[PDB]
Amino acid sequence: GPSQELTNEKEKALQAQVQYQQQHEQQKKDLEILHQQNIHQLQNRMSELEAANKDLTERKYKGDSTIRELKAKLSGVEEELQRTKQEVLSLRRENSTLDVECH
Amino acid sequence: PSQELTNEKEKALQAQVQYQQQHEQQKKDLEILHQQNIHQLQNRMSELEAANKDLTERKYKGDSTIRELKAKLSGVEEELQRTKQEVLSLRRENSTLDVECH
């Protein structure tokens, strides 16, 4: 068959186009898989570092409110100390005047 | 008839050349995209590392400030207790002198 040999070549060319498309799709899939393996460890270390940062930022806010409570507590005690020291001065002054009137 | 056959074999050789150029071009394009993505991930990683360094430094500063405040507060509470006992002693002296006087 002279034309049967020609029809065989046209059949072959259609089959070769199908094979090309399959090989082009397979190369894409293989490259995406290699890519995922390349970024896997880095994506995991990134998510871990974001969560550690979220926890630290949360801890920092708690630390600020603790500092605020401590400063206000300290200011109250420093003022109380001031009014007790002045009470001592007042009492020393009173004691001296009373002591001169007996002695 | 034979020239038409030689034309089909010439065409098939050309289709193979094209498929090969296309296979290479898809790989190069994917590599550019993947390299771009890797650079973005690496950049985000370096900014999370810098944010973590900054947070760890703030955590040290906050915690050390808390530690200093608690120790300062204990010192003042202790000094207050001493002064309060001095007031009690002076009020006792004031009461004994006041009874001898008025």
Side-chain angles (χ1 to χ4, degrees), chain A residues 8-47:
Chain A
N8 182 57
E9 294 305 295
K10 291 177 164 228
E11 279 169 57
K12 227 187 284 187
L14 278 160
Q15 210 168 293
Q17 170 77 355
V18 174
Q19 277 320 308
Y20 156 70
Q21 288 176 110
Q22 291 175 12
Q23 281 156 13
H24 210 67
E25 277 150 37
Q26 196 52 72
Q27 164 179 257
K28 183 172 190 170
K29 283 182 189 213
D30 294 342
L31 289 167
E32 298 170 313
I33 285 155
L34 184 32
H35 184 69
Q36 292 156 12
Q37 295 185 300
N38 284 334
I39 74 187
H40 187 74
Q41 267 204 246
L42 188 60
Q43 301 183 308
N44 283 353
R45 284 211 187 239
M46 288 179 315
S47 63

Side-chain angles (χ1 to χ4, degrees), chain A residues 23-83:
Chain A
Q23 281 156 13
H24 210 67
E25 277 150 37
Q26 196 52 72
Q27 164 179 257
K28 183 172 190 170
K29 283 182 189 213
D30 294 342
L31 289 167
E32 298 170 313
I33 285 155
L34 184 32
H35 184 69
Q36 292 156 12
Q37 295 185 300
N38 284 334
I39 74 187
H40 187 74
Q41 267 204 246
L42 188 60
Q43 301 183 308
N44 283 353
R45 284 211 187 239
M46 288 179 315
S47 63
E48 190 66 86
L49 202 36
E50 281 185 278
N53 288 356
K54 183 191 168 294
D55 287 304
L56 280 160
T57 58
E58 158 265 304
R59 289 281 194 96
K60 183 223 186 289
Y61 296 131
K62 268 166 183 159
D64 298 334
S65 60
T66 298
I67 284 159
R68 248 189 308 285
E69 284 145 62
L70 284 162
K71 289 182 173 163
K73 191 162 172 102
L74 180 61
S75 196
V77 182
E78 289 174 321
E79 304 274 26
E80 190 174 353
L81 174 59
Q82 159 258 322
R83 72 175 77 92

Side-chain angles (χ1 to χ4, degrees), chain A residues 5-6 9-10 16-17 20 23-24 27-28 31-32 35 38-39 42-43 45-46 49-50 52-53 56-57 59-60 63 66-67 70-71 73-74 77-78 80-81 84-85 87-88 91-92 94-95 98-99 101-103, chain B residues 1 4-5 8-9 16 19 22-24 26-27 30 34 37-38 41-42 44-45 48-49 51-52 55-56 58-59 62 65-66 69-70 72-73 76-77 79-80 83-84 86-87 90-91 93-94 97-98 100-102:
Chain A
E5 185 185 4
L6 297 168
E9 294 305 295
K10 291 177 164 228
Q17 170 77 355
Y20 156 70
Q23 281 156 13
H24 210 67
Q27 164 179 257
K28 183 172 190 170
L31 289 167
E32 298 170 313
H35 184 69
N38 284 334
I39 74 187
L42 188 60
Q43 301 183 308
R45 284 211 187 239
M46 288 179 315
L49 202 36
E50 281 185 278
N53 288 356
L56 280 160
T57 58
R59 289 281 194 96
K60 183 223 186 289
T66 298
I67 284 159
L70 284 162
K71 289 182 173 163
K73 191 162 172 102
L74 180 61
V77 182
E78 289 174 321
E80 190 174 353
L81 174 59
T84 65
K85 285 187 185 307
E87 193 168 2
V88 163
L91 284 164
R92 285 203 225 274
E94 274 188 77
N95 283 6
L98 284 164
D99 187 30
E101 292 171 4
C102 302
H103 307 44
Chain B
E4 200 166 17
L5 179 59
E8 292 304 294
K9 63 195 198 204
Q16 290 298 111
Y19 295 157
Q22 278 161 16
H23 204 69
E24 280 148 37
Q26 169 179 78
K27 183 175 164 91
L30 287 170
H34 293 166
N37 186 43
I38 288 152
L41 272 43
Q42 289 173 179
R44 176 57 182 152
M45 185 57 181
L48 293 167
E49 285 184 294
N52 181 267
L55 282 159
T56 61
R58 280 152 152 197
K59 189 200 179 278
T65 301
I66 286 162
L69 283 165
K70 290 185 175 168
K72 186 159 195 152
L73 180 61
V76 182
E77 289 173 324
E79 192 180 349
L80 176 58
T83 319
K84 279 187 185 307
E86 193 170 339
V87 164
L90 284 164
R91 283 199 199 132
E93 276 185 69
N94 187 90
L97 282 164
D98 187 31
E100 287 177 41
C101 286
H102 316 287

